[PDB]
Design a protein around this ligand. Structure first.
Ligand SMILES: [Zn+2]
Ligand SMILES: [Zn+2]
Ligand SMILES: [Zn+2]
Ligand SMILES: [Zn+2]
Lengths: 205, 205, 205, 205
């Protein structure tokens, strides 16, 4: 990608945002990987939308890319696991444990064991290190504080967190310059003409 | 929305498509509801991605909007139900039947009953009207033929199926006209300058 | 079986009952099929022990033996089904419906359909014929009244419901007569000897 | 219980066995706890009937009564757990692990952990100590060899494994002695009379 093309994506993001296409904004953030939307991230975390949270992240980093990004995924999964335990759905908890969390065992063998053993407890708050886990809403919120730090420290992000500030609807302004450029080639030009389309250059007569 | 704004969305779609952002294209198709992508629809149907198929459709129509759109949803769900029956997951099949299909009972009470009764069969091919259902891949394909017709007949679609043909990267061309417009205001203009950004108007000196 | 042998079973039942071997009594009732214990039946019905209720019955009748015995099984299963629906375990309810209840469809096709359709309801009390079903304990109790009638009318039972009245521990009394018979063959007999065993005839000297 | 009464149970067992009441024999073995039927035990083990195996045992010992009986239960459960893992029903495996096996953790904390960790494996034969587990039929059989030893060594059993040998239908013989005793009191006695019943003493005239 040129830096032109890259910048154009940003204009487009602005536009989509202003046109209130909320889902389309975040697919583009993700697919381009140019801007990570914290506010959106927090929102989805709080809503416990784990499939989308992982999906959004996946446009910025893979699980093993570096240590920050590995802890980020680990934390998210862990919470997924615990919520399953709370609703006493141990069938799900197990599914998570093997499918999502097993990848982390290589890096710490003993912690994986210790987390596995939570399955056998009447309440995982019987573990003193997890004795603090209060309700879902709260755990999510406390975890979010941690994720924000991890992300801001992550070198794969650090340059993606701040939307370059620019005049509203820059794209629309640029578009206009092109319609003005089209008519200024018209001769003999009417003073104020009608636009046939954006699709093909305007003309007068 | 102005017709300007509407047309601009199309340029954007073209661009996103050319930049190979495939997911972002289809979110925008859906959220704008301006263009229904048949090819994409077929693809997702074949892949049995039912959650996304319904989601994509939902940008163009609700289930009860008209008779075509109601049969479209009905057909899709029905297949969802049958696939559940085939993998002998009758727990899912039941979930579908009450959650997704019940809405259709008002409109036909007896058919809902008749579909409900398929649960009790060793194989639903014991019903002669379903005796034809061959493998998944085939049923999907035959159903697709039916959906295509339903959609092309649906008045909510009929004006959304054909992408207005236009020169490649029209958006990029327009952008350029604006950079040319910017420099042509430069005086004394250098002959060929460097672009500082798309974000704020270019200048020379 | 001789009527001797048959009568001996009854003595044995008395004995087991007096020795408080409760499970062994009812296996013998079932396996011999000579006596149906109403009190036990009521108890198990109330406790919702369906697997044992069907098992106990199976020593007296099969499902299709006659019309009374067919309604008895049907009623029991139906309640099994409804209880599954109440705990909103529709996966179980379906399992019951195909495995246990399907056998009854031959005899009434339409009722099977009507019962099948209860799966789709938010609450099966939406059916006015089932609008009466109050709590489990109550439904069981009302159903029990019905079962008692069905059983007392069932010709396969009618001659099995009343335990022939007899002196306590008749078996023990008979045993004694045999030990008295053994010693009365002893000569020269001591007046009051010790029993070596029941296993082989007693002797003196 | 008198030793009379105890011996009478044995006669009864013989009788029930000869009358082919197979279920009633084993309920009585269990409820009396006087005789443990190895052959029956092997049979049920091979058939993987775990609920009945534990039930039968429960008439002879509780889980914590002594060390042999504790290993016996542990072994049985462990196999239950592994079979669940093989059919890849990890929901069941977990159910077993917490409900049945947790009791054993007190006595060995680390082994419980090590067994818990088998849940996360693609195949538990990845553990070299379980690398030997071949098919179900075989594992059951090898385990049976082990159980037989454990039982024969268990002091709660050691005196319960051998059925005292006695003439066929001893009970029937004893019964007869009582009918002979009844008629020998008849005077004037007919030479060969008819038995009115076993229920009340016979008489002549
Ligand atoms: Zn013009
Ligand atoms: Zn310039
Ligand atoms: Zn004597
Ligand atoms: Zn006599």
């Amino acid at each position: 990608m040129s830096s032109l093309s890259r910048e154009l994506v940003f204009l487009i993001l602005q536009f989509l945002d202003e046109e209130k296409f909320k889902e389309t904004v975040h697919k583009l953030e993700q697919e381009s990987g140019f801007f990570f939307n914290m506010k959106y991230f927090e929102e989805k975390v709080h809503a416990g939308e784990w499939d989308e949270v992982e999906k959004y992240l996946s446009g910025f980093t893979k699980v093993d890319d570096n240590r920050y990004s590995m802890k980020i995924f680990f934390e998210i999964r862990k919470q997924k696991y615990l919520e399953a335990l709370d609703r006493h759905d141990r069938a799900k908890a197990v599914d998570i444990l093997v499918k999502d969390l097993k990848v982390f065992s290589t890096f710490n063998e003993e912690l994986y064991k210790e987390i596995t053993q939570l399955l056998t407890l009447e309440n995982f708050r019987e573990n003193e290190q997890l004795s603090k886990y209060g309700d879902t809403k709260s755990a999510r919120s406390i975890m979010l504080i941690e994720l924000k730090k991890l992300i801001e420290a992550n070198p794969l992000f650090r340059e993606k967190l701040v939307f370059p500030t620019l005049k509203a609807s820059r794209l629309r302004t640029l578009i206009n310059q092109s319609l003005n450029w089209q008519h200024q080639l018209c001769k003999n030009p009417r003073p104020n003409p009608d636009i046939k389309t954006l699709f093909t250059d305007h003309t007068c007569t």
